[PDB]
From a paper:
(A) Cryo-EM map of the CBF1:CCAN complex bound to a 30 bp DNA segment of C0N3 containing CDEI, at 3.4 Å. Inset: CENP-LN, CENP-IHead, and CENP-TW form a basic, closed chamber that topologically entraps DNA. Specifically, a basic surface on CENP-IHead forms extensive contacts with the DNA-phosphate backbone. One consequence of CBF1 engaging CCAN is that the CENP-LN channel is extended, so a total of 25 bp of DNA interact with CBF1:CCAN. In addition, the CENP-LN channel converts into an enclosed basic chamber that completely surrounds the DNA duplex, a configuration notably reminiscent of how human CCAN grips the linker DNA of an α-satellite-CENP-ANuc. Last, the CBF1 basic helices adopt an asymmetric dimer conformation to accommodate the CCAN structure, most apparent for subunit CBF1A where the N-terminal basic α helix is unwound by nearly three turns to contact CENP-TW.
Kinetochores comprise the centromere-associated inner kinetochore (CCAN) complex and the microtubule-binding outer kinetochore KNL1-MIS12-NDC80 (KMN) network. The budding yeast inner kinetochore also contains the DNA binding centromere-binding factor 1 (CBF1) and CBF3 complexes. The inner kinetochore centromere-associated inner kinetochore (CCAN) complex (14 to 16 subunits) associates with the centromere, generally through specific recognition of CENP-ANuc.
Numbering used by the authors:
A (entry chain L): 2 to 242
B (entry chain I): 2 to 13, 25 to 117, 130 to 245
C (entry chain O): 222 to 364
D (entry chain T): 269 to 360
E (entry chain N): 4 to 165, 186 to 309, 315 to 341, 374 to 451
F (entry chain W): 1 to 15, 36 to 89
G (entry chain B): 218 to 251
H (entry chain A): 221 to 251
Amino acid sequence: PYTWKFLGISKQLSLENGIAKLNQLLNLEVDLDIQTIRVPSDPDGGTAADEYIRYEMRLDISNLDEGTYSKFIFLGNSKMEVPMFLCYCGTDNRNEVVLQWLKAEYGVIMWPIKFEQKTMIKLADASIVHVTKENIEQITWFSSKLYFEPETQDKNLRQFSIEIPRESCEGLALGYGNTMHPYNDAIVPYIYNETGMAVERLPLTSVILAGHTKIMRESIVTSTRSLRNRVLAVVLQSIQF
Amino acid sequence: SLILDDIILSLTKTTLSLLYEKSKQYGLSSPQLQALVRLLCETSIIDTVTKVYIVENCFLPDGYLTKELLLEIINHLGTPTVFSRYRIQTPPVLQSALCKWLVHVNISSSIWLHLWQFSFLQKWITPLVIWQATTPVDVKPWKLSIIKRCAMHPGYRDAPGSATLILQRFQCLVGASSQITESIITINCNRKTLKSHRNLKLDAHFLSILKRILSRAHPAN
Amino acid sequence: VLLKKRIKSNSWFLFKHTIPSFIDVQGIFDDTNGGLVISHDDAYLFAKRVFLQLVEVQKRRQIFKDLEAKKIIHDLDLDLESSMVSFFVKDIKVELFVKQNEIVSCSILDDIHDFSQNNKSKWEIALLGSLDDLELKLNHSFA
Amino acid sequence: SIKPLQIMDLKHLTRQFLNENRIILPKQTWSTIQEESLNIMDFLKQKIGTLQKQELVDSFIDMGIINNVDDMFELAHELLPLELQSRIESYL
Amino acid sequence: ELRLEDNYVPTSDTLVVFKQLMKLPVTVLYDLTLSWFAKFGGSFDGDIYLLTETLDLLIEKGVRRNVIVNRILYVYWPDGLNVFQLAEIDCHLMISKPEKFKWLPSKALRGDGKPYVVKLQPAKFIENLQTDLAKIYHCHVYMFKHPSLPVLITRIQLFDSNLDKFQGKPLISRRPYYVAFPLNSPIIFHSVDKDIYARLVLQSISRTISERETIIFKPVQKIPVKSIHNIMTLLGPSRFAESMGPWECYASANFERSPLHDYKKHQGLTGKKVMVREFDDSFLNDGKEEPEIRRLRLEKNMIKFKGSANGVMSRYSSLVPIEKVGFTLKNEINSRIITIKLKFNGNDIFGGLHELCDKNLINIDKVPGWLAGENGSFSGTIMNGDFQREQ
Amino acid sequence: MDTEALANYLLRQLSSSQEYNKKLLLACGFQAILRKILLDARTRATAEGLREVYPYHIEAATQAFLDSQ
Amino acid sequence: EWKKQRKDSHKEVERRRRENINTAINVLSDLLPV
Amino acid sequence: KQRKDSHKEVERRRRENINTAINVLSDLLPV
DNA sequence: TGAGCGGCCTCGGCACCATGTGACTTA
DNA sequence: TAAGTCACATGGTGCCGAGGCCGCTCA
């Protein structure tokens, strides 16, 4: 239950320099981690300019809950119109101090990120593909639940959900064929063919993967302590102009 | 006008009606308001219903409220304690009505916060300490500790919802002063009393009276 | 009554119908050819079996409305299938439970001081039978 | 009836104490303490019937709650509004 | 002797009865007062005609209902209202405000399994029910016919037993249990209650209806629906039962006339105006479309969701509003059972879905029958294209 | 409902300024009894491991308290 | 942390076990007549 | 002293009911 | 100006699945 | 020691009756 709030950044800011100023301001050492991930390793997802820069800023004091574990995750690519976004979990009041310092030090323009319906479908696609230490990608199947809150006159239809079990989801994926985006290619077309609902047009408020994560229109909350690389990448292509 | 402070110096039934109608026509100046509240608080021969009728119908400022008027009012909002017994106790309904009239119109923030610990004043002190807190540096953990201590204190009625409103304003204001939403969780979770506290009525008849008096008052001010 | 073909068995099933619930159209359809129906003859047999019930209720309501129209009986109350009825002949509240075109139960309710109970039972036994016979014998005993 | 208190009176009385210090009361416990308030009031009136200066603080020392008058006007500090505890301090 | 007659006075709170009679209009209060004083009488002294003249003076005085409520609760019957009064006021509240009550249907199965079309002799049924429930609890039952609907609504009220609580000599009432009897229908509507007293009342009702062969009530639906008119439209003995949604045209028969009618006005001669529906997938690809064909696609959605071109008559409101439905669609995609659980919530599910179809969010050419309102207020599993309801 | 309301309850149970102060101190003592009893109830519930308290818990706590008093 | 990583791994194992139980229940319900 | 009809006591009852259903189902199985 | 019905709505009690962790077993 | 099965105790979503204030609202 770690909600991730997403904010975009107008500039490619380099964090390996100047973080000592943040350490002096906050009177505590942060555990900045540098990684260079290549998310679209699939040939159909692109084979060039796939490298990202992943920063994991962490206000490390103690490890009991998110009151002392408000992580910060930054992702960046210099070959894009918008070059950087951040996402941070927890509810500590030092996080907005970190954001204010980031603004006042790098001169960046920061705005909250809202996901569209197709963006949420692509994020649900991204959050099942897991990278393994043997450098392979594994699709872990979760019993999804598309959850809608339509606005109709006289509040005729307040809300309606579409629950899809795990074995039915993998059966739909195997029926479509060998694909790496199951929801956008197999689940959503099956829903459209059966019930007539275009879920990329309907007001979709959340899709819930049971036991793993439940992404919303403005936040992503995950049972897992971190956020995988595919979700970060899909958020990064989401905010492009 | 000179009729107002002439009636004030005369008070040192007909005078009350003349003061009411001249306030409804002209309105008092800041030294006139100072003298009027100084006369009203110190004596007790005037009836309490007439006292609240004065503070709800006669106090009508014309321009800026000076700091001296606030300092004189603060002197009258105190209570007799073990270190001050010579001064008489100002009536609590008069104090509450005066604070309500103040609602109608760094040191001073702590002044109003230390007066917030009064039980009967809590229903009108809270907009003042909300409106005083305009900057993130104004809030501090000692203010939060005092607010939480008086909020969760028993023997109070308006303290939970109103102090939850204060903490909500502080959370919306600073984004710092390490997290206080769990302190809000410790205080009441009914969303009804502070729901009624978050919308407040200011007696729009008196607002229109002050509106017309102030429109009769200074051009381009 | 609308019948759709089953996808896996090639036989009609009771999809939708606009017939009220006092006529067990599902039971009649399941009774037709022992469940499944295939040919148009079985569908027409089910249709005739339920149309006979429609004829029964319409004919019963027609007989009672004609009894009211001839001013033989006073104001009466009809239920939906016109089976449980009650009416006044002069002032006697005669209430009837009637099955298909045949009265199987009768009840004389209103009691007059001149009116007795053995003659009441004899009238109740005599009033049983067909509906046309009831009209004829009621007009006979009215005079 | 007239002498027993109500359940909502106990909510308004001790709701903040069960909130700051985490206490969970089901409805059966609420009815039980509504019953117990009468027994507590009868025991308090049996122990202290009339009220004068020294006997109340001597009884509260015997109650095991306090040890001196300092504990008296510190316990009154955490249970009364500011004007009332100042008035009690002027009384003691 | 444990049966409760129509003259016993129970202990009822005066303020609850005070706020209960506030909702009734003045004319039903007038009719109730004259009927009550004609039947049972009151503590007020006077002739029946004299009391009629007094209430007449009250009604051409134009007095508010509060004064007459205080009168009938403080001088007419100051000791307390009789059980017949307490039942009849609440039944009149049911008549005045039908949307404040939720009902649960139950079919009257019997013997082999054929439904039993229940028929009631009302006075004998009330007597037998009261004698049956008198063996267990202190029961009073009151029965009346709806002024508009062809039903027979009963009201079963059960009474229980009874620091020093001083003395009351009371008989505390519980919430009443209502069971609605349509005239000729196996479906029985009863109030929403799952405690042991509701089970006792339904059990005694099943034992006292039968008298020839044992009858069991099997619940056909677990989601309550408001507004007794709507549940007679859905589950009652009407044409709209088993013809809902796109098939309400058959239940209303607005499309064909008698064969004895003018054949110049036949549908096949005058014709109807329709549009070519594109079977190719073009809904996902796509502004200021022509207002005549826009009216035709609005009519197409209206026809799909309400059965009629003009509807059964804002305009999205269906014949019966539905609160909760849940469909479990199952298919077989290459020897794999693929289940999809669609749950719905709102004030009118199919009206909201019609509005979403009008906003081009749901393809009206691909919206199935069960989603369109067919077999409405029934939640079930769609296997092999056939909808079977849940139990 | 303030402590002065409980003082009003106590005075109407027994039926100037100094007696008002006496009754206010009595109300403070009553609140102290209730707080101590509830603290003992939580202590025994946590000893047994239950998150909430129950009537037998607080009955045992108040019997142990009145045994010492 | 090491123990936190162990707790996360055991959490994932228990989640997989619960999903297997639910899948078996759904299969058994698919074989059911009603 | 068994007035506990809340959580940690009704979830235990539901879990025991599920366990008994699983047990009788496995009892009907040959192995 | 004053009573007054209706959507809102939250309290909270109940119902049920969902969930994370220690204890224990298997390899 | 990594992984698995287990009941267990808490988290949480949905639901609904009670009741309160609101929101005009109309005479």
